[PDB]
Point group: D2
Chain length 256, copies 4
């Protein structure tokens, strides 16, 4: 099956930033034809820890910038919603509607996304056990979702730390396609970037249906997740690496 690579800048800092990253993702989509790329970027960081941190330039501006990426590069789009009313307007551009990790249990948000007819990708809450996602998928199917993804992005492990329990990949695969979030899994809520590559190698070795990676031309200047966003120049190499490891490991992937 075609491997999914969801990548892009964490937040829509500007339409310019989006086009710069989109240009590269487009180039890679022409090279890695066996991969289905989906451009990701949040129009709003609605859950920052601090009231003083960057949130975004609004829904309107964001959807407009994303529409530009899709129009200029012909790339599929995904962005996250935070309240039910956002599903409809976002669905006009987003091929995949993303559900934030803290909101993976909010029934109305999941239902709002499901009825748009668009694909839905739910970030597994840091408080959720792998088997607890069966009901999340059930809600989505109940709401009309026909293409569902579950994203592994780490689990609460003590204070200000997350651990990736890779047993979650084969467990969640029982009821949905599985995506591994390579950048949020190494973040320290409220010794990070150095683990992005090794853990993503682990993910494809275990087996998943895609990977999610935030990338920015200059991470140190990013207005969000400056500590975990992958330098854009490193994207091509990481992708080639995971495709290689996926290929050699693939014959051993267990059947669900």
């Amino acid at each position: 099956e075609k491997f999914l690579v969801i990548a892009g800048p964490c937040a829509i800092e500007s339409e310019e930033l989006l086009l710069k990253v989109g240009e590269e993702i487009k180039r890679l989509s022409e090279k890695f034809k066996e991969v289905e790329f989906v451009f990701k970027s949040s129009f709003d960081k609605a859950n920052r820890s601090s009231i003083h941190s960057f949130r975004g330039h609004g829904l309107e501006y964001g959807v407009k910038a994303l529409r530009k990426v899709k129009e200029e590069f012909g790339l599929k789009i995904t962005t996250d919603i935070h309240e039910s009313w956002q599903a409809e307007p976002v669905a006009e551009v987003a091929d995949i509607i993303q559900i934030p990790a803290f909101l993976c249990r909010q029934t109305d948000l999941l239902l709002a996304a499901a009825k748009t007819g668009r694909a839905v990708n739910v970030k597994k809450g840091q408080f959720l056990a792998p088997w607890d996602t069966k009901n999340v998928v059930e809600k989505l199917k109940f709401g009309g979702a026909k293409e569902i993804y579950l994203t592994e992005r780490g689990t609460t492990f003590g204070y200000n730390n997350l651990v990736v329990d890779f047993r979650s990949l084969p467990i969640m695969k029982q009821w949905a396609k599985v995506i591994y979030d390579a950048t949020h899994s190494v973040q320290l809520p409220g010794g990070m970037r150095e683990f992005i590559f090794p853990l993503i190698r682990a993910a494809v070795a275990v087996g998943c249906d895609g990977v999610f990676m935030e990338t920015h031309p200059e991470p140190e200047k990013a207005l969000s997740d400056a500590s975990t966003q992958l330098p854009l120049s490193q994207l091509e190499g990481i992708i080639e690496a995971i495709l290689e490891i996926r290929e050699v490991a693939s014959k051993y992937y267990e059947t669900i």
Copy 2:
């Protein structure tokens, strides 16, 4: 102020149920004049695990039932909101607006609640560290809130289990009044009731500004948190118990 006791049935199964519980809380209110009682009940269980579980009768029916309790018994009210638009209509009756644990980082919800001018009680997310709540308080203050509470309700401890780290009480006290949720702290996400009383005794021994307890005439028949809701008949005894323990222990509560 005086010790706060937030109690009531988990969900508004019917205003009839609210009246029955309100009557008992009213009585206790007259018996323990040194305690400030606040009647609690959710008009919607917006985060149930299963799509087939009870959610409620809607915001309108709920606010109406809560109005009936306040008018008929002169009791302060508190209920939780799940999306920003709900803050205003709920504030019409709620003296304290409650913010769900999973939603404690949603900036707009916090701001929406703070804008109503009402007091705000934020349930500490199971993924949050005690010190990470300082930023939560700051968002509310920025939003104009002046009466702010933080509620301890357990922290993710492995899968399908929560642990109460009592160190959180003195830590959170540095920036807000602290409430201990005696019923949700012992629930196993996705042997419970036997630990409610023991842990509530610990909470007052350590020191807090109030306690939160869901109570129902017949917990076994409750449509929500049936396994953890306290039988109404046992409420008086537990309240008297914590007041006695508090009276003695308060002598040793650390400053700030």
Copy 3:
């Protein structure tokens, strides 16, 4: 039943140190006649993190110093063993043989202690679940132990941190007398002392059969656990406090 207070300097830094602390413990035993005091001090810190840290002056010297405390003050004694061969010589002076937390599953060590005829107190391993202690007690009974204690000293919670799950007290009480370790529970393996008092208040409010507290005339100069040992001058006040909280809470202690 007579409450147990196990206290003393973490390590036997010198026989002099022991006599100084013993003198105070003796004074308190004359005042708090409802408490059974047991003087504690390790002849060897066999599990320090660093090879460069203080361990002790040997078994011989330690047993001799402890015998002096018992002889001069008439106080019961307890110390921990690390290998089976130490049970016999230690049993000559120790009224209670202590089993280290990391060694709570070593069958031969538990058996060696049990056959001495002395009481045995097992520190619950940081890796052990409360219900997992039933088998620990079974081994001891199998080995002839007639007086058994289980000590709560925290559970692994993320890296370099421990949490006290107070549900462990009533659970372990099902098969043994329960002791709460007030000083090791707040240590950060490999923001500490300020939590000793509040957590011990929680322990007696929930209900336990005794408390364990390391105390040193000048903690900052201690050769071990300098961050958690309680200043000797503060011991009397803490003990009075827990006896008061125990008394008022006692009528609510659940029957096992």
Copy 4:
């Protein structure tokens, strides 16, 4: 050096069993010349949960059986010690002395093992953080050890569960060769086998110096770790699989 594969039956149920497994490991040894095989089996399960569980036939019978394996198949040997006095007699046959996870902080055991001049493999305690292993290595070096291994076997994650934090592999590599224990990492202290292969694939994808795997002709009849021991017949396939994954992934292993 070459990739290390430590394999064998959990416990020495009989030297007969050891010979049968040794024969298969010998064969694979001749098939994969690029791999250094080490036969493992414990002469005593000194930390079983229950007093009524299988421990073994003693140190003498065990060392004799292990001798038979080395003599008959020319295979290197490894077994674990539980008390200091055992290091010397065990070193007579063991090329690698194994230190139990619960005992990774017992200074005398580590020193005793290091004194034999043999290589030492320390199982990382379920309570230890990856960086806390630096001090473990230092103890062994101080004791004269020169060939040191650290084995990843899971970390305490809530009650009766272990999680493998793969970030530990690159961290521990800073001061010792790293081995991944594929069978104990999925055991539930106090759905297991299905995760052995997936996680071992992750381990080599991330990068380690070897893998540890308990194997038995008929796991269902094993007297120890029956639920996690790999059927002997499946050993060849898994080894070939990890060698192929390692071959491809090694290109991306980070330096130090």
